[PDB]
Amino acid sequence: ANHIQHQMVQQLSALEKSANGRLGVAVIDTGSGAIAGWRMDEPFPMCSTSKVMAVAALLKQSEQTPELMSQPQPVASGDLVNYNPITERFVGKSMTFDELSAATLQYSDNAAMNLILAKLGGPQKVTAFARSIGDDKFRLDRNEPSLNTAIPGDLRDTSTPRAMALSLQKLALGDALGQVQREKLSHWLRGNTTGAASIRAGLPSGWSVGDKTGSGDYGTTNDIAVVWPTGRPPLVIVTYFTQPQQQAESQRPVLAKAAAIVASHYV
């Protein structure tokens, strides 16, 4: 199903061309249930937007063992990879899975992601969790940092804008998780620190927003968001963007613009 209007298609098509890349956009109006998109069924490299599915899988596990999220987890220098803004401070010490989840979602800490993957049983178990909530497109093949290679034509570590939007809805707004867990996830997303230039920049400043960004090779520039418009049912917005050359620079303003285009057609 696709509820995208003619004008919106024209705008997103034009945006994609101006930016010299491949843009994937999905928006769900949770009030009506309507979904609208551009390239929303093509695979895109998820990069760090995959951290949401991993933290959600862990939260699901915590439903049957609430103390899971407060148990100390040792972190070692050997756990560190290419970007460890929070975890590098805890070498030789321990962090709870709550702390690791906040770190990976709000700062995109890659060592934290790998520690969470270890607890879950790896990328293949995050993929099995995605299937368990009805997502048949999500696939996590690798851990950090190799999951970010983002090569055109490569199916590893991809999802589609439609599938990720539907999953984010189920996890942050719907009933895929227990109440305590859903609220945890939603508050972590709302506290993201890396999203100011992406979807958030294109939305009305008064709106409450939770998001997770992603960034990778081929100038891959991603964001997935839950949006609480003023006096209106929430929206779910996915903006995926990737570029023709491996060394391409990020283009966060493309995501802001895509969000603005979407926002205008719904507010």
Experimental approach: X-ray
DSSP bridge partners of 116: none
Q: Given 13, 32, 48, 215, which residue is catalytic?
A: 48
Identity at 170, one-letter amino acid code = K
Paired tokens of 117: 């993957």
CA dist., res. 101 & res. 6, Å (int):
40
Taking phi first (over 0 means left), then psi (-120 to 50 degrees means alpha), and beta for anything else, what does residue 159 get?
beta
- Cβ neighbours for 203, distance < 8 A, ≥ 6 positions apart: 209, 227, 259, 260, 263
Q: Which of 253, 51, 262, 256 is nearest to 167 (CA)?
A: 51
Domain count, the chain: 1
CA dist., res. 77 & res. 91, Å (int):
6
Active-site annotation holds for 94 = no
CA dist., res. 203 & res. 212, Å (int):
15
> Entry resolution in angstroms?
1.3
Q: Which of 230, 233, 174, 173 is nearest to 203 (CA)?
A: 230
- Domain, as residue range, for 7: 1-267
